[PDB]
Design a protein around this ligand. Sequence first.
Ligand code: 0E7
Lengths: 11, 259, 33
Amino acid sequence: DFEEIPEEYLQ
Amino acid sequence: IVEGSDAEIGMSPWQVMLFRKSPQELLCGASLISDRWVLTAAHCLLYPPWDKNFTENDLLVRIGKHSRTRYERNIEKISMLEKIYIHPRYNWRENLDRDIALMKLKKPVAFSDYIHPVCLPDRETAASLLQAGYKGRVTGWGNLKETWTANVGKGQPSVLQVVNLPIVERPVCKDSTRIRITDNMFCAGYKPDEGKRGDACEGDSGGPFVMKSPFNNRWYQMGIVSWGEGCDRDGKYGFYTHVFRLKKWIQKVIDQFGE
Amino acid sequence: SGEADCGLRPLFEKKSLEDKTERELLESYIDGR
Ligand SMILES: COC(=O)[C@H](Cc1ccccc1)NC(=O)[C@@H](NC(=O)[C@H](Cc1ccccc1)NC(=O)CCCNC(=N)N)[C@H](C)O
């Protein structure tokens, strides 16, 4: 898969 | 990108990445054309026969990438969408005619050695460059081979793939397909006499197809990655949305709207 | 379209450098010579 990304990028 | 080659750092600072939040996945390509405007095929966002009808709060645009999977921190930049503008006459039922879409970033993107906009052509650049035989360049993170039951290796790019493909003459495109061609869509790829190979492929949709102008040392987006039958198959070519033709729309949407 | 210097890459055009395949493109326009 893909490397998790900064949660903030889901607002 | 079938039989392509790995890009290089900053070789296409305009290639954007349509990233789906949940599931987390690669949707398609795109193009930074302005600091706050991205470009894409219409089918990455709309496709009734497959249930695609994404809304802005369902996507992410990753710019500065190079790595399909990593999360290049302090290099790439992730942006959220404000609106999705698709061409009103987008025809999904038979041939994805007018396969183009404009995305508007909730906020602007800053430029760096890896995030730079691509230019949209004019009639004169179109006239000089858009000619059968000339070569444009396609870059993207989609498939390396056409889904074949018998192919070994579960492959898809490590990093951003790049390939150069020649423009073919409209009659040749038309006699190769049984799909109804259209003024808003051209084709590229080697012909059976050249023997060579290469192509765009599944996952590559929405990607730029640029050309560099020798009269000004400038990169120009001549097309958008769109459709084809199979990937890299004999006597077959790939089709790109003629960006210049639909160019009136683009600017109609851009000028006094999302500014 | 806030661009001003579109199509110009910072790591090549702007620093006068070429890439592994540019000249292929630039030679397709019938010829390099
Ligand atoms: C044998 O080929 C086929 O049956 C159909 C022909 C078709 C084309 C346009 C519209 C309807 C049907 N081809 C595909 O579905 C091909 N898909 C595609 O070409 C999809 C667009 C698409 C999405 C959904 C549905 C249809 C078409 N786009 C892409 O793969 C983008 C890169 C260009 N493709 C390429 N060189 N093969 C696949 C790679 O073979």
